[PDB]
């Protein structure tokens, strides 16, 4: 499913609104990308499906901390 493995961001629903304020249901999707992250501690690449926001989280916190969070949530990588 379209779920960020780092942040848990997923599709949310809302409205399109016309100029006449006609509401039609829409979705807002996360900006997801499959990305190979270098994990220096394992001498390995780990692929995560991550939002652009999740990539900024990884840049800030570091991949090792994030993967530690993933294991503790039962999030498989």
């Amino acid at each position: 499913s379209r779920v960020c493995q780092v942040t848990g961001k997923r599709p949310v629903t809302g409205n399109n609104r016309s100029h006449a304020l006609n509401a039609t249901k829409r979705r807002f999707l996360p900006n997801l990308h499959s990305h190979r992250f270098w994990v220096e501690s394992e001498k390995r690449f780990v692929t995560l499906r991550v939002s652009a926001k999740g990539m900024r989280v990884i840049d800030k916190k570091g991949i090792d901390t994030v993967l530690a969070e993933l294991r503790a949530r039962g999030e498989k990588y």
Partner: peptide, 27 residues
């Protein structure tokens, strides 16, 4: 992205080249 050269950048330069090739680490 702030890095220490082991051998400020654009985040992609750090993420996808410098850090994996062992040329730098984040500040």
């Amino acid at each position: 992205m702030q890095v220490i050269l082991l051998d400020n950048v654009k985040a992609g330069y750090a993420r996808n080249f410098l850090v994996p090739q062992g040329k730098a680490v984040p500040a």
